[PDB]
Symmetry: C4
């Protein structure tokens, strides 16, 4: 297949951990049903397919009814567009094949939405960064434009699985220019580093450590 | 009805979340009795009505007996005044109708008290800010004066639902000039932003994000 | 009785909370046996009386055997001295009567020890400050000298009720000159404020609040 | 025996706690089986001896299979070398006898690996410092060179006992020049302080405290 964002996340850590992923055995024993977001993700998107695949099945129906509340979100879930459609493109600079498959893509006005669920909508507002959700904006937006004509509107639709004051809050987030850019420079920086490993068949694994700030080694 | 503080809190977040509130269905299933503060709130204020509406009913009686201890608080609960009385007024600048209903209002000396309960009286001293309790001072004080003659004394009566060293501590807090002001500028700023949405029927929902401080994107 | 350190801790917070203490009813229902330190405190000090007043009674014996390990501590528990002996004195400046009763006082070399127990010996090293244990040094040391001739050696004997790597660590701490002083200025500052309330029969209860650092009200 | 790193860690805290260790009775009652790392540590190293000494015995097999994934790690576990081999040497400066026994030592290319397990591979990246794992690099590397010819490559092999996204991540860490050095200066500084106690038979136990940063005693 191609290089997804989930991949550039591995090279980001350490080039080696990239091919590690594609080997380390998993413990096939999904015991928690915690992927309620995976469920929500399907409810919101594939509405029929949803009925397929506890006393929690009520939350999912309540949450979904919550995003239908705020207009901008209701518009997103509705409108006219495609869902899991994949997108492929060669990165101009590295010539590498990239792949990203936007949760929902509204053709008419070039809008890309991405469903995500959390426990703290407030925490999100700063957490996203460590999930590299800005690199996920830059990366889909770049692959999108570079295949459909122009940079789309990337909008994160976040929903909470932790009722607050009687309801389940929802929030539509968009990446700020300063960050959208940082993300674009990150994946390219990632792509280049991935390109070396290929041609020069070497994938460093050693993560070098450096004294922390509180290090008494300098007050 | 009018625009409460609880409303300007929504526009504060995002103009959209304001009309969201007035639509998102709640999960009518109050299972926790955790609103002991809601109870306390009634014990302290509506003394008779309280007997109406577990092995916890003892705490509520103990707490209430704790605020009767420190003089200033005992004075507050006693004295002569009205309780849930609503207050209405048009904001001079926006002409919008505002509403706020002070927990207890002592006419004689223009004192407004507001019962609140927490787990850390120490945490409160800095937490209040994220609950926008300063905007709740400015907003009641402004609506009060602007309807009774002069700015009252706003005093938060906080009580803990987490015994410490044998008792349940209570604390009367008042907003400091620097903060009381910040709160007054916030709600006005909120009101104005609310006034746009009305006349210009548009309510932005997209919350734009910005790189966090620790962002390696600049060391 | 007199004014203990535990009292100046109340006036420190708010003059009112001082006379609050002496009124707020307690919930006489000691259900936890958690005061294992209260126990330890007796084991280490009143060795016989200890046998008086679960599967935990083994820890207390193990801990006590741990402080007997490091020499300085074993010396402390042994040596020749008095225990709960109270000490009384008028504060030269305020003329107020002060009282403090050192856990163990070794006459021969003027050593005052104070048994204390915690969960993190590492946390202590910075936590003490919020317990005002430095004001407890200054206050006992001052009352001591001012009654026995000279400033003693104040040493905190801390023990953990949370085994680590197979044992229960113990640590003898002493207050650093910079802090010992800060503590001495605090209690005096406390004493003076206590002296006003007496002569001017007024005890403010209102704790004025001030915007926190992260207050967006200034970036 | 000699002075291990685990010892210089005690003198580091307080010279006394060093001889404390060698006296404080332990509570021989290993009830938790939590030393799964101790197990892992044996699985990875002593492969046969492992079969000797629950529904968790599957994780250990899964983890071990995870480090075999990333090449650099698989190389480490394989290759040709000795395991628990001890190493002894006199510290040139203090003349003291030092001892350190590297988990795995690959002779051919002078590589020293050290198996360690954690809950947060991300936390490690900054936590190590408080475990003094940099002093454990400097100390083994110094004893190694100073006995085999040259400074080896010290590599920490960390593994998580907390599945993430379906697998158990592994990470090979190496100490950065800045830190490797800080560690070397620490143990020497430790050794010297240990040398005093010996010749001058005195072992201070009192840990002097100093006001914390947030100390209102200076804003």
């Amino acid at each position: 297949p191609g290089i997804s964002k989930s991949q550039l996340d591995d090279i980001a850590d350490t080039p080696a951990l990239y091919l590690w992923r594609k080997n380390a055995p998993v413990d096939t024993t999904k015991t928690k049903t915690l992927d309620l977001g995976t469920a929500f993700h399907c409810r919101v998107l594939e509405l029929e397919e949803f009925s397929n695949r506890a006393e929690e099945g009520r939350k999912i129906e309540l949450m979904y009814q919550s995003v239908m509340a705020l207009p901008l979100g209701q518009w997103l879930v509705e409108s006219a567009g495609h869902a899991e459609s994949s997108i492929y493109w060669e990165d101009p600079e590295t010539g590498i094949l990239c792949r990203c498959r936007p949760d929902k893509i509204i053709p008419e006005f070039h809008w890309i939405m991405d469903v995500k669920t959390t426990a703290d909508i407030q925490r999100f507002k700063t957490a996203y960064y460590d999930y590299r959700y800005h690199v996920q904006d830059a990366f889909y937006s770049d692959g999108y434009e570079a295949q459909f004509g122009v940079q789309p509107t990337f909008v994160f639709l976040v929903a909470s699985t932790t009722i607050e004051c009687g309801r389940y809050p929802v929030e539509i987030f968009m990446m700020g220019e300063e960050a959208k850019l940082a993300g674009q420079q990150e994946y390219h920086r990632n792509l280049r580093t991935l390109s070396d490993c290929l041609n020069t068949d070497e994938w460093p694994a050693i993560k070098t450590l450096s004294l922390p700030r509180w290090a008494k080694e300098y007050a």
